[PDB]
Design a protein around this ligand. Structure first.
Ligand SMILES: [Ca+2]
Ligand SMILES: [Ca+2]
Ligand SMILES: [Ca+2]
Ligand SMILES: [Ca+2]
Ligand SMILES: [Ca+2]
Ligand SMILES: [Ca+2]
Ligand SMILES: [Zn+2]
Lengths: 263, 182, 397, 264, 132, 265
């Protein structure tokens, strides 16, 4: 039996883990080998027993975007704002703040189309370069030659993480550097309420919705102005209660992956 | 529109409305739409008497004193309207009464009727307010003519009672005089 | 019971009709009935009370008959009559209170007080007079196993119930579909809500059903049906099913679509009303089925479009509603209504005299519990107590 | 009934008039601000309407009792009655419909206006008490639906706003600990007297005696008398329901019943 | 009462029935727009429900009389009964609870739907006229 | 006149001279390059209804210099902050300091360890060069990750800042190493909003965070923003909509007579 699903529910009118993802520059600026222990003790005062708070270090937003892993019950990701990386930040936030169900795309043998507005193509790797060629009903190219890749339309160049959204209902002949990239046909099931992102700097530029008419700002997308990483970490520790209250631990998945694979 | 008709003259809820209407009625005396004596008649008399008495008034000071007297003397003014054996009296302080001419027995005040009457019908300054009138009637046998004249603010009857040395009326006039401050 | 009602009725007629200066022809028959009552009651002794704090009182009867000689009643006649009537009325009052404060799990229709058991004897049958009141009339019909009926204004049929059911839900309670309802007295308010506004539902319609069964059959009921539920149209913070957390409800009201109200008696569709609002008539039914849909507006202006997106962050939750008031009805059983004071009288007597909880009624005569479990024994006891309460109120103001 | 009660009163026996939805509450819509600022950004208080037979009260707190002791705010509402009611059946429901919508309300002194943007929570520790001479005659805690008050002259409604100890992300965002309070926590009660019995005459929804007396007076342009307020205003009558007013009201109501026995 | 009125009517005398909450208003839930446009984002008008014995009306203005003369917008609602009532006891209350929550309403012609997001103010200069 | 006690205020739902300080940067005056510009704005404000002499114009060289103990004496204050992509935190701290009411007590870093009691309590340091270095202590009053004696091991949370608002973890003692020579640090507690002052940022993209809580970054009514190319146009806009700006603002609560014995100014 399922977990009681399909049956109406009527009503009347610590043990968790906290992963803290931060960039390398934060540690470089703090320059104290015991800062992890200090933060753990401060979390202990806040109410998190020792051994429950883990700190993860990623070099760059681009490098973190390569197959990110979500480990703890609650994940808090600090991304430093960069005016020239707004799309990369938006894509990372989308991937780690929404659940995805992905399937393989062997583009060397098949044409692919996006079923509906929730379907996208997620490319991740050392360096990805997506070139798409839409196909007409007779399977010929619309503005491109299937046999000539150079006529294809560039949609991404040397991008660690790409979320391509082509017109739905039209097949596409794809060309990617499969050696240094993996392309998956993914579907956005919904929000992942066990991950929160605290942007550090900037002006609320995260767009986690491919739709242009909507740029929503969920409760799990925060922003802080900063000058010292020590102050940033003190803020996180002191307001950990509010951050956790903003997110639900029940969304944790069995695997530490940003998406489900043919599940 | 407090009353039945919307006029610029009539623009606890009853206390507030009657107080505002009375504050506007104060200008009826200037407009010359009253009967009998006026609070500003008393104020002008007191101003003249004090100006004659004073030995510390300079020509450059007289204009200010006259303006202040016109604007300040007797801040608490009450006005009454008589309508076929009914009297509606209202003060600037929010005290409102309604009574019968003959027996001086209080009746529930009708703000709408009061506004309708005070819009155009002459307004009598209540030199002898309702409280003093009732006290005088209780402790003294006011005749029908005396009550009529006192309600109409008859200078003749007012001076008659002052000369007779009626404590109640003398006290009322003394309070009126003492209220002429600066 | 009929003897008790006859005593009350004759005393009421005596107080109304035996007044100074009236003709004796106006009271000849009433005085014959009164003297019959006095003759039948003389020589008997009664005892009322002894339960809880209700005092024990002993009643003896030795009264001379009322005269039959004056052309017009005078002060002396009225004084004698009232001195007798006051004692008789006090006796009736205490008999009724003793009967009201008692209940029985077996033979609940039968008299429970000693005094009413005594009056059930045949010798008192001569004091029967007429049974004209609605409650005594139905008492007699029920004794004869004939069809009965009480007319109620706003019958208090639905036990208080404010609840909600969720057909789609997550631990975050951010994308919910379900129903909310308040059933109280004679009022049903139901709201069907969908957070996604049926964006992905088949045919962009979400179906909602609310089935309210009654514990007794109602007949010839006038019902006001209105196309909205004002009680579920404002923001709410509602604790979850298990009380572990709270969820937010921010409704936007749309018209209910394909509204169908079915009144069924034993599962057979007695009445059906499609998309009709206002005053309707349900002639015979024991359950109400309200079916309504939320249809996603096919055409939206920019404001509504912004309200209803196709992504998860649903800030506004589409909601449809129905309100159903039962203005009047007829029920073969007794109920509480908004006009009568019988439930009030019984409850008041019990509370005043601190009657311990019995084996039949719930504590404090809680109407919600009573009508939730309106057992046949409870119905018998309730009719008995209500009939005696009406008899009492016939004399006591 | 009316002549029965007339004769009983003359005989000094206890009278009784049974009313459906008695008009016992003088119309009164008001609010009390226990915590206030000139900007009206952060308010705590109560807001009620008493009219006819219905009391609708609502306590509101803009901070949702964030800093209150035990995260609880207590609201009380005391409604006296001008006459004692007996054997009254009352419906008590846990929400005040009237005060559950966005409002722009003029301040206490009328100088300015303030914004009320409620979000409704369940009233907590509800206690409705019916008191006679300051003694609790009836009391119902956390019980809604139909209740009975056998004898009382005042109603005391106590309820609490409790900050939900557990909140989903939407609720947590709804209620912040900072100053800007976009949504204001609100709890409330509704109490309707469906039927009651009074020793003194009253207006009600099922009788036409007040209507008849007022209609005759209006039709014949009867000047304001020494007893009744202008136009037989029921609000003023039931506010200053003096003994002389009660006597005159019972006399006119009895006469009106006698007249209606013959006139349609 | 009913036979008495029957006899009085046959004699052509006065007839009278006393009603508690008379069903004198035919059901009518509607709205009138005095200012409008296809976007339905700046609307002035009145929406009402007449049903049974209750009229519930609400006048709304999206601009809150920003450009109205004297910052006052007038609203009127006339309900003609089909029969003359007499000695009627009525209750008047200063809010329309039925039109105080957000809703989406179909257009007059049904082509599209428009959003109504009321914020409730106190009605001033309330006048109720019972006319014969 | 019952001062110092809170009595409930009852109202009915049936019932129906100031001065304006305008703070601007020196860049504005330099661009305007007119000696009579303040008098011109005074006449324009007079047309708007502000009597001559009731509008004061205040100048500050930079946000950094203005942040050094800003004093705003006026019934209504309007600050024309200038956006800078590099000074988001500075702008946020200045806006918080001026837009909120802070009750501040002295701090003696040389004599007492300090902790923050609740979420509303911060440490506000102002001066020529505020360098704040903290060292948290455990229950034994021994540093956590910092030797108490050695100040180098401390954790720097500011450097040569004119204004700083520090928020350490609550309930834990800290030893401070502030440069008291050219900086004063105070234990401040945020009581509520200051209705007297409003900020009109020129340029930028709404980057003001006035709450220590990271989950919330409210945008109150007193925080406004306008795109600009000419300071003349900026001042004309402010003059023309001074009615709206004043409506958004409100008279300072703490200054009213009702504030007596309730932390009056
Ligand atoms: Ca990218
Ligand atoms: Ca091409
Ligand atoms: Ca697509
Ligand atoms: Ca700074
Ligand atoms: Ca260190
Ligand atoms: Ca802190
Ligand atoms: Zn009714």
């Amino acid at each position: 039996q399922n977990y009681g699903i399909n049956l109406p529910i009527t009503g009347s009118m610590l043990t968790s883990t906290l992963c803290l993802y931060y960039p390398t520059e934060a540690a470089t600026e703090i320059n104290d080998n015991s800062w992890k222990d200090t933060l753990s003790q401060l979390f202990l005062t806040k109410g998190w027993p020792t051994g429950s708070v883990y700190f993860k270090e990623y070099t760059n937003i681009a490098s973190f975007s390569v197959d990110p892993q979500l480990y703890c019950d609650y994940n808090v990701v600090l991304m430093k704002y960069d005016a020239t990386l707004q799309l990369d930040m938006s894509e990372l936030a989308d991937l780690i703040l929404n659940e995805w169900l992905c399937n393989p795309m062997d583009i060397t043998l098949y044409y692919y189309q996006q079923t509906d507005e929730a379907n996208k193509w997620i490319s991740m790797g050392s360096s990805c370069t997506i070139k798409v060629c839409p196909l007409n009903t007779q399977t010929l190219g619309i503005g491109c030659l299937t046999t000539d890749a150079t006529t294809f339309e560039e949609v991404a160049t040397a991008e660690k993480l790409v979320i391509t959204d082509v017109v739905d209902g039209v097949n596409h002949k794809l060309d990617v550097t499969t050696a240094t990239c993996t392309i998956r046909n993914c579907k956005k099931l919904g929000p992942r309420e066990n991950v929160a992102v605290i942007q550090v700097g900037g002006s609320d530029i995260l767009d986690i919705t491919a739709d242009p008419t909507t740029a929503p700002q969920t409760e799990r997308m925060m922003r802080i102005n900063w000058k010292k990483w020590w102050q940033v970490f003190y803020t996180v520790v002191d307001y950990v209660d509010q951050i956790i209250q903003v997110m639900s631990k029940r969304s944790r998945s069995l695997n530490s992956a940003a998406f489900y694979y043919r599940v | 529109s407090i009353g039945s008709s919307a006029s610029a003259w009539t623009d606890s809820s009853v206390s507030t409305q009657t107080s505002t209407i009375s504050r506007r009625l104060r200008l009826k005396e200037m407009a010359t739409q009253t009967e009998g004596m006026n609070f500003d008649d008393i104020s002008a008399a007191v101003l003249k008497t004090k100006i004659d008495k004073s030995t510390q008034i300079s020509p450059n000071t007289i204009p200010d004193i006259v303006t202040e007297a016109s604007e300040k003397f007797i801040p608490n003014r009450a006005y009454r309207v008589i309508n076929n054996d009914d009297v509606f009296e209202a003060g600037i302080d929010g005290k409102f009464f309604a009574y019968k001419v003959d027996t001086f027995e209080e009746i529930p005040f009708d703000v709408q009727k009061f506004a309708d009457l005070v819009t155009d019908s002459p307004v009598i300054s209540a030199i002898i307010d309702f409280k003093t009138l009732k006290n005088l009637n209780d402790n003294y046998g006011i005749s029908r003519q005396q009550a009529f004249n006192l309600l109409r603010s008859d200078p003749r009857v007012l001076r008659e009672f002052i000369n007779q040395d009626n404590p109640i009326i003398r006290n009322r006039i003394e309070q009126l005089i003492m209220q002429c401050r600066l | 019971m009929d003897v008790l009602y006859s005593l009350s009725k004759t005393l009421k007629d005596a107080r109304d009709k035996i007044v100074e200066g009236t003709l004796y022809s106006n009271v000849s028959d009433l005085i014959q009935q009164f003297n019959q009552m006095i003759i039948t009651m003389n020589g008997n002794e009664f005892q009322t009370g002894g339960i809880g704090n209700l005092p024990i009182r002993n009643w003896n009867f030795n009264f001379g008959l009322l005269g039959t000689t004056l052309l017009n009643l005078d002060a002396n006649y009225v004084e004698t009559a009232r001195n007798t009537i006051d004692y008789f009325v006090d006796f009736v009052d205490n008999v009724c209170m003793d009967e009201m404060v008692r209940e029985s799990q077996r033979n609940g229709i039968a008299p429970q007080s000693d005094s009413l058991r005594k009056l059930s004897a045949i010798k008192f049958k001569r004091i029967n007079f007429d049974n004209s009141s609605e409650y005594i009339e139905n008492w007699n019909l029920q004794n004869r196993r004939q069809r009965t009926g009480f007319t109620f204004h706003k019958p208090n049929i639905f036990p208080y119930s404010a609840s909600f059911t969720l057909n789609r839900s997550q631990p975050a309670h951010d994308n919910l579909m379900g129903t909310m309802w308040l059933n109280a007295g004679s009022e049903i308010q139901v709201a069907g809500f969908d957070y996604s506004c049926a964006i992905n539902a088949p045919a962009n319609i979400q179906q909602f059903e609310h089935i309210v069964p009654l514990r007794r059959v109602l007949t010839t009921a006038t019902i006001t049906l209105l196309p909205d539920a004002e009680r579920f149209s404002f923001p709410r913070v509602i604790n979850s099913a298990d009380g572990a957390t709270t969820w937010f409800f921010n409704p936007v009201i749309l018209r209910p679509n394909n509204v169908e109200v079915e009144f069924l008696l034993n599962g057979q569709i007695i009445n059906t009303y499609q998309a009709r609002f206002g005053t309707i008539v349900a002639r015979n039914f024991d359950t109400i089925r309200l079916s309504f849909q939320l249809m996603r507006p096919p055409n939206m202006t920019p404001a509504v479009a912004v309200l209803f997106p196709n992504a998860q962050p649903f800030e506004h939750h589409a909601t449809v509603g129905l309100t159903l008031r039962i203005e009047s009805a007829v029920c073969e059983s007794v109920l509480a209504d908004a006009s009568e004071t019988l439930l009030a009288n019984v409850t008041s007597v019990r509370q005043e005299y601190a009657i311990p909880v019995g084996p039949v009624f719930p504590p404090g005569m809680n109407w919600t519990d009573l009508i939730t479990n309106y057992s046949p024994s409870r119905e018998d006891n309730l009719q008995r107590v209500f009939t005696v309460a009406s008899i009492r109120s016939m004399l006591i103001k």
